[PDB]
């Protein structure tokens, strides 16, 4: 990866090639863990994208490396997009700002498209167990939601529908298959409720979605050993915080 490069615009030197295909998974994984320590998420992403394109199922650790990588890559755009639009909404110079907002949007989309593409071609296709399927549908939900944050007209409608369908499917499976303390399920509830709150703008359903997931987990918490406990509660804190805000 000393022989790789990513463009500003979120297009890269590409992974669909002998160079990345001739690498051992174990290498790519270590390259990713490094890149992560080094906070270089373009690299980490590229690495995981290449691990996914080998077409084997991802282990747990592998799922999260993928998730974290793309989270940071796309998150950097979403942040910038809010700053820019906020500066726009506060205001000759507006053409220039608007153009810049759109440069960011274009970047947001390639990254989302890339991720949605990986989810469809590889990750969901081969899910092979409920927990994984839930993780990937939640992710599909999330990346469509990031698109919806910047979408407009009927592009907005399609986007929203596609996010809602993924979340809902994930929501059902998680309820059928997973303990209410499971961090993936809680994380899904959290993001689904945010979708309800900020995208659909039904704030009361957002609260009920979160309160429910919270309450049902709180019941089954004396179950857990310390280690799992910490995983779940980190997310519950977020559920509870959101509820406080959405009732302030």
């Amino acid at each position: 990866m000393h022989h790789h490069h990513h463009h500003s615009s979120g297009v890269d030197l590409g992974t669909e090639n002998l160079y990345f295909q001739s690498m051992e998974k174990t290498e790519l994984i270590q390259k990713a863990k490094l890149a992560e320590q080094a906070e270089r998420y373009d690299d980490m992403a590229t690495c995981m994208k290449a691990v996914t394109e080998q077409g084997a199922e991802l282990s747990n650790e592998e799922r999260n490396l993928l998730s974290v990588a793309y989270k940071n890559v796309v998150g950097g755009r979403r942040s910038a997009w809010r700053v820019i639009s906020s500066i726009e909404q506060k205001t000759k110079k507006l053409q220039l700002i608007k153009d810049y907002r759109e440069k960011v949007e274009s970047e947001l989309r390639s990254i989302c498209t890339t991720v949605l593409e990986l989810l469809d071609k590889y990750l969901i296709a081969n899910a092979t167990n409920p927990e994984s399927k839930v993780f990937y549908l939640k992710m599909k939900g999330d990346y469509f939601r990031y698109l919806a944050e910047v979408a407009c007209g009927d592009d907005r409608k399609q986007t929203i529908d596609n996010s809602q369908g993924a979340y809902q499917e994930a929501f059902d499976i998680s309820k059928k298959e997973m303990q209410p303390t499971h961090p993936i399920r809680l994380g899904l509830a959290l993001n689904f409720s945010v979708f309800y709150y900020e995208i659909l703008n039904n704030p009361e359903l957002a609260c009920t979605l979160a309160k429910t997931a919270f309450d049902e987990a709180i019941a089954e918490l004396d179950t857990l050993n310390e280690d799992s406990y910490k995983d779940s509660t980190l997310i519950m804190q977020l559920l509870r915080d959101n509820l406080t805000l959405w009732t302030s």
């Binding site: 939640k138 999330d142 809680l186 994380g187 899904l188 959290l190 993001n191 945010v194 709150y197 900020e198 980190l234 997310i235 977020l238 915080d241 959101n242 805000l245």
Partner: peptide, 6 residues
């Protein structure tokens, strides 16, 4: 900040 899953 609203917040979403880590």
């Amino acid at each position: 900040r609203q917040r979403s899953a880590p």
